[model samples]
Target: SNLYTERVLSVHHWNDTLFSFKTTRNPGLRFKTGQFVMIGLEVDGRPLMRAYSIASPNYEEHLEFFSIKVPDGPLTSRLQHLKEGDELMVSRKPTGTLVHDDLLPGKHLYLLSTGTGMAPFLSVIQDPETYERYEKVILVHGVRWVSELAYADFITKVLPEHEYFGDQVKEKLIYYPLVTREPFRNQGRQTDLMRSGKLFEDIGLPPMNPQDDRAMICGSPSMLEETSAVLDSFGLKISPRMGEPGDYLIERAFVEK
Candidate 1:
């Protein structure tokens, strides 16, 4: 199909580099959480679209997205100023490999993210299907400054607000936010943390085993490649969107420069 009209519902600016916005969802548009769709604005004459991860769950009446403001980037130079009731072009065909169907059944989910890359994991963790399939989900977000750790409170709150997991949300949702540049409780590059054994110690979790840990990673291309090496040491391999099940996967487009 083609682009559809969606009314902006809300907007939240976090910093010079990031913001979040919501838009009225199409009644007929169906997308699993953790997928991205082409969204844009009517520029000089036509649409200027970009792929944004749908940060809201499938059940939400509105779609949400977390975005970075690329200073010279065509769409975001103006996209950062979006406000309530603004018009947005929400395209059809939301899709990605991060959804549950791409993985074999497992005991835990490790959502590894950084900066705005955290967007899809926000949707995945909120989806009850996540808890139903895995006994636990550990979300590890690495950011430069503590302020850049967007949605920390909300991700932690998922446990309390979790309908399916209920109080088990406490046990199931383990959020470990890391600050690489600033002095925070947990500090280091995620790749380094995985290399040192400090990450496992800090989380009080055991080393990742392919038998029990299935993961979805979203970050820079280096982060994906380096982390994949670490996971390989654990006998884990990248899972594809369309293929036999594997222990981990990545959205190459979003993370790649």
Candidate 2:
């Protein structure tokens, strides 16, 4: 019984730079939303590992992963070439502090992500437990092009029909798609969106306050750094594995780009 042995069920290219794949699920696998697991292909005699946040909920029978095709990335460069039936290795244990347990209880849950960082939040948003625990779920996804926003489309379609959360999610989920390059309805970097109050106004939500809000952020290091600062300005403290739950959580995707 090799937990790492996984067979690809399907693959979809969202754009030239982004793609997603589904694979046969390990029967015993269990993980909370927003957790990351080591994944890669076994090459030669070794297994190369890259930490990817599980993009599907714990209960799903199949596993999903969203990724960006990094030009020279060791894992992704080869990974992007994979087709259906391909096999990859995944770790037995999934771990990360980005899960709901890391945040204190709050009425509104905000998931802020950029590029492929949207992966984990995708899992969190679709989980029934998320809707049950919070009154509202706001997901803000930022990308450079409108074409790169396909995962948002995927999320939108399935959320309204999921068995455990369909009805509740229909009324509770709010997706705000932002594009930085080739301007669209929502433009500007995410940090700027938060700072200018544009994001709050657009979403019809008040500015983030630690007292009533909990936020999860994942993206490039720069995006994470800046967004973390903005959240902190609103009195949000960073949640970690040891400390009492905080109002904010963060994770970084593994990629060179």
Candidate 3:
């Protein structure tokens, strides 16, 4: 079958612009952490789909996605009206370039994003292998307002107390939230922080380099290119393809500028 019809389990609104939902998972569906799948609803007798990063970890029993609601937008306008027990369509094949397998080993892992770009990294951080692979996993979430810093508690407090991977998570994960339009502990665009070396300073780490830092980026098209340039100046090479390893990776499949 091209798609699996799953029942919605929950829908959470982070703010006016953002929301997330969980859906029942097909036992046969398999995907790596950080990949995306086509998800949608039956509209006008056919599925009107869009690619979405699977925000939940691969080990989770259900599927989750972080989304932005645009007024009058084709998908979100209708998708936002969803409630528990509603049916949604999910494609069977999941694919993306942001997996841990695509990057060579390094001491620090940087998962950087803006807006809904933060979705994929949500899944990446929850995997046990992420802790095993890097000494530090720094998640840089950039948003316009303090309110848009979704999952703040889960990343900072709850994950540290995870029953099984608590110790490792507490020791390895560092969540840095950047808010541009409002006052917050951390404020600035990630690109500026990187260029000025402020992000590393605030995080108490040395500047990124090709030798010891591996990065994965996801954001709007502009953010993707801008951040990539910063990494390039630091001599970080973007991952070539799925099998051919490299120093960093960027995902632009799901996020719109």
Candidate 4:
């Protein structure tokens, strides 16, 4: 059977509207931490599709996705209602160039995301390969509220508790949460943080440099455009799959709503 064929394993509510679901894993599938693939379900004999960054690491047995509740959203309205045992179709040939292979070597790896864009980074951080390539991995997740920060929290808890990497990852991984809406510990849009130099100061890292820094960005188009501009100001260039490696790689989160 096609692995992308809709198959829903289980679902549960995270809040009043947000929900999560688990689905069957494709045995032959393999994807990098920062990649995205098409996901959909058949409705009334029609296939509905949307690209979603795979949230779990490649080694996991099952797949997980985090979604927002959009009442008027074409795919999400129905997707939000999914339940245990429901079927969810996922594309077999997972594809995206945002993976680590496209970037040049660097000592520090930065994963910059906002809202659901954090999905792909979730996969990357769990993979041992990420740590193998860089001395330090910093994940900056931007969300509107505290509730939206759950996945980052989950990743934080899981990575340090894993038997194999628990001890080794202690000083290697850093999770920076930036809240843009309600007041919290850290607040501001990513661009604002980067422009003010507060982001580097807060993280205790020097400003970005093309020589020793590699960054992966995923978010809305505006966020990507604005953040990329900021990175460029700091001497970062866009790293493409086919071109010479530079300082950054970026992909916008697939818009399902």
Give me the candidate number with maximum TM-score.
Answer: 3
Any residue pairs clashing in model 4, and if so which? 4-90, 5-89, 6-87, 6-88, 6-89, 7-87, 7-88, 8-86, 8-87, 8-88
Report how far off residue 199 is in candidate 4 (Å).
1.0
Error of 4 at 89 (Å): 0.8
Instruction: Give each model's whole-structure lDDT.
Output: 0.83, 0.85, 0.91, 0.80
Per-residue alpha-carbon lDDT of candidate 1 for residues 17-115, written as tens digits (9 for 90 to 100): 888999999887799878889999999999999888889888878899999998888899989989899999988899877778888788889998888
lDDT of 3 by residue, 1-257 (tens): 57999999999999998999999999888999889999998888889999999999899889998998889988999999989999999999899998889999899999999888899998988899999899999999999999899988889889899999989988889889999988899988989999999999998899988999999999888888999999999999988788778999998835443
For candidate 2, the C-alpha RMSD (Å) to the true structure equals 1.7
Output the number of the lDDT-best candidate: 3
TM-score between candidate 2 and the true structure? 0.94
Model 4 weakest 10-residue run by lDDT: 1-10
Residue pairs with backbone atoms closer than 3 Å in model 2 (clashes)? none
Write the residue-wise lDDT of candidate 2 on 109-128 in tens digits: 98999888999998898788
Tell me how candidate 2 scores on lDDT: 0.85
What TM-score goes with each of the models?
0.94, 0.94, 0.97, 0.92
Candidates sorted on lDDT, descending: 3, 2, 1, 4
Alpha-carbon deviation at 31 in model 1, angstroms: 0.8
As a whole number from 0 to 100, the lDDT of residue 59 in candidate 3 is 90
213-233, model 4: which lDDT tens digit per residue? 889889898888888999899
Report the error of model 1 at residue 209, Å.
1.1
**Against the hidden true structure, what lDDT does model 1 obtain?**
0.83
